[PDB]
Amino acid sequence: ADLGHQTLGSNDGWGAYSTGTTGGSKASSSNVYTVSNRNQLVSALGKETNTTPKIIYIKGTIDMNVDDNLKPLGLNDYKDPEYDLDKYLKAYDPSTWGKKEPSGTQEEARARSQKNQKARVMVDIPANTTIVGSGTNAKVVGGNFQIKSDNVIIRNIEFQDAYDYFPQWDPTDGSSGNWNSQYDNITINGGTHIWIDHCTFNDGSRPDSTSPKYYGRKYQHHDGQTDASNGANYITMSYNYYHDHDKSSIFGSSDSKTSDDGKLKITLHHNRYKNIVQAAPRVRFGQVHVYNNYYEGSTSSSSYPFSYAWGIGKSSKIYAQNNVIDVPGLSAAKTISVFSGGTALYDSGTLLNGTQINASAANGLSSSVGWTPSLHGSIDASANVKSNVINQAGAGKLN
Ligand SMILES: O=C(O)[C@H]1O[C@H](O[C@@H]2[C@H](O)[C@@H](O)[C@@H](O[C@@H]3[C@H](O)[C@@H](O)[C@@H](O[C@@H]4[C@H](O)[C@@H](O)[C@@H](O[C@@H]5[C@H](O)[C@@H](O)[C@@H](O)O[C@@H]5C(=O)O)O[C@@H]4C(=O)O)O[C@@H]3C(=O)O)O[C@@H]2C(=O)O)[C@H](O)[C@@H](O)[C@H]1O
Ligand SMILES: [Ca+2]
Ligand SMILES: [Ca+2]
Ligand SMILES: [Ca+2]
Numbered sequence: 590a591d592l593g594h595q596t597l598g599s600n601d602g603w604g605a606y607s608t609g610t611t612g613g614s615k616a617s618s619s620n621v622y623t624v625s626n627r628n629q630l631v632s633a634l635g636k637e638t639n640t641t642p643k644i645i646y647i648k649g650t651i652d653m654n655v656d657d658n659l660k661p662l663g664l665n666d667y668k669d670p671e672y673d674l675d676k677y678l679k680a681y682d683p684s685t686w687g688k689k690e691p692s693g694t695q696e697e698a699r700a701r702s703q704k705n706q707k708a709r710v711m712v713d714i715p716a717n718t719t720i721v722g723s724g725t726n727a728k729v730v731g732g733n734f735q736i737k738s739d740n741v742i743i744r745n746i747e748f749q750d751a752y753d754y755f756p757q758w759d760p761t762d763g764s765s766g767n768w769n770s771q772y773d774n775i776t777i778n779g780g781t782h783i784w785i786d787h788c789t790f791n792d793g794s795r796p797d798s799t800s801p802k803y804y805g806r807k808y809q810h811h812d813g814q815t816d817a818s819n820g821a822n823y824i825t826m827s828y829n830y831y832h833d834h835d836k837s838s839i840f841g842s843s844d845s846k847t848s849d850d851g852k853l854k855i856t857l858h859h860n861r862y863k864n865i866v867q868a869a870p871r872v873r874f875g876q877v878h879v880y881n882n883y884y885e886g887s888t889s890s891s892s893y894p895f896s897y898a899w900g901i902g903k904s905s906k907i908y909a910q911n912n913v914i915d916v917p918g919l920s921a922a923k924t925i926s927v928f929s930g931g932t933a934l935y936d937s938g939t940l941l942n943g944t945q946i947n948a949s950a951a952n953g954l955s956s957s958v959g960w961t962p963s964l965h966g967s968i969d970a971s972a973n974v975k976s977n978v979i980n981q982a983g984a985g986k987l988n
Contacts, residue, residue: 590614592721592744592987593621593644597784598966602825602856602878605964610782610825612719612742613642623723625649626659631712637738639715647722647746653710653732654752664754667705672698672755681758683804688760696757703755703771710751710772714741722746725985730793733772736780744786747984748774750793752810758803767806773813777821789830789984790814796833798892811835813868818842822852830983832863833893841873844903844930849874856965857882861982864893867926871900872907878962880910881969883978888918897923899948903930906958909948911938913974921946933958938971945971 597610604610613620620641622633625648633645654662677695680686710731714720716738721727722745730749753770760766774790777783792811800808814831817824817840831837838857841849853875862869862884869884870877879899886895895916899907914924921941925934925948934949935958949956969977980986 593646593719597742597825600964600966601784602827602858602964603823603854604782604784604825604856606782606823606854608740608782610740610742610784610823612740612784613644613717614719616642616644620644622646623648624651626651627653627655628657628659634712634715634718637713637715640717642717643719645718645720647720647727647729648724649726650728650730651732652730653712654730655709662709667702667754669698669701669705672702678803681760683760683766686760690761691758699755699757703753706754707771711735713737716740718742719744720746722984723988725988727984729774733774733776735776735778736783737778739781741780741782742784742786743775743788744784745788745984745987747789747791748814749791750795751812752795753812754810756809765806766804768803768809770810770812772811773816775815776813777815777817777824779819779821780824781822783824785815785824785826785829787828787982787984787987791831791833796892797835809835813837813839816840816842817853817855819846820849820852822854824855826855826857826860828859828982828986830861830863831865831869832861834864835866835893836868837862837865838870839868840870840875840877841902844873846873850904853877856962858965859978859982861978862898864890865895866893867896868900869898871902872905873902874904874906876906876908876958876960878908878965879912880965881974881978882912883915883975884913885915888916895919897926899925899934901925901927901931901934901952901954903928905931905933906960907934908958908960908962909934909936909939911968911971911974912936913940913971915942915975917942921948921951924948925952927952927954940971
């Protein structure tokens with residue numbers, strides 16, 4: 590079968606659980622589409638009631654920041670008439686405004702401006718859908734795919750620059766505040782039975798290094814690459830190339846969403862993470878199998894300096910096997926970041942800078958997470974992970 594008609598293997602990670610992940614493999618002939626712009630993509634997907642099996646082939650580059658006639662849209666196109674960047678900044682400057690939450694005219698106009706862009710860039714994927722890139726050059730630019738449904742396959746696409754024109758100031762976000770944006774490349778919002786495979790996620794032409802600092806903080810236009818939230822469950826992400834990006838993969842969005850417990854069952858294998866700052870993945874609550882991934886970066890880099898790989902968040906149950914980390918000067922302990930509520934981590938075969946380490950013991954964590962994965966393919970020796978992943982991960986490695 591071609592990539593359009595293939596299904597996730599019956600042993601291939603948490604996505605193969607119960608009914609599994611077939612996407613739109615069983616689609617009838619009038620439910621197979623080829624799309625090369627925003628209009629065609631949106632016609633193809635249709636609405637949430639469009640649940641028959643379907644296959645969607647992406648041909649070339651699809652820019653999501655366009656109008657109904659496909660003309661490029663920008664800041665002034667989305668801008669609420671009452672929004673102004675100068676006046677937003679004057680309004681909420683810590684010096685005069687303090688640490689209270691931004692409110693009043695500018696923030697309200699910013700929130701309306703954001704919903705204007707959102708309406709173009711953000712798109713829901715209906716149940717029983719396969720979306721695959723044709724050839725080696727399928728791209729989605731500015732786009733944020735959202736999956737709230739069941740049974741979706743996404744393969745062989747380069748996702749670039751999920752860029753928010755209206756970042757929000759949060760003075761209470763960390764010790765000196767932060768700017769936060771809304772668009773991921775893919776948001777799995779209560780979505781189930783999902784396979785994301787042979788995709789590439791990057792920040793395109795607008796990396797964070799082209800953004801100014803306001804209030805001494807990076808004016809952050811980006812959010813996640815592949816985030817999972819609100820009871821997302823039964824997901825495999827395999828052979829993806831994540832590079833040149835700050836916050837990659839946040840699984841479980843809130844310490845309060847105790848309902849995520851027993852959910853966020855996600856399998857990450859054979860993914861490349863180059864020049865990613867943090868959260869690869871950051872986990873709350875979930876049984877996440879992380880194996881045969883390769884991480885590479887620099888703590889002293891000028892655009893995307895390495896902070897951590899695995900986030901041990903509240904009640905997280907990460908089971909890590911034979912992952913390879915290449916960050917010069919990094920200690921065994923600093924491969925991960927431990928958050929309150931985080932007490933446990935299984936890891937075996939972890940290689941840091943060519944040396945075998947125990948990341949869990951290095952951090953004083955419990956070595957058992959109360960589960961062992963049964964659904965997985967072959968496990969590479971740590972000694973072959975770097976080669977296998979570099980050669981195989983990302984868009985345009987198949988076609
Ligand atoms: O309005 C809607 O349409 C949506 O509403 C619901 O959504 C909200 C929100 O709108 C979504 O963007 C998303 O956001 C998540 C968090 O609420 C948000 O704070 C953020 O979080 C991460 C991380 O979880 C958090 O701890 C923190 O990180 C610190 C620090 O800020 C960083 O700078 C760094 O030092 O790391 C730290 C750390 O790791 O702890 O901020 C992080 C960040 O991304 O900046 O982003 C989350 C996310 O993107 O998923 O979901 C929210 C939610 O309530 O679930 C609704 O759920 C949704 O369906 C829409 O309708
Ligand atoms: Ca934040
Ligand atoms: Ca976020
Ligand atoms: Ca997100």
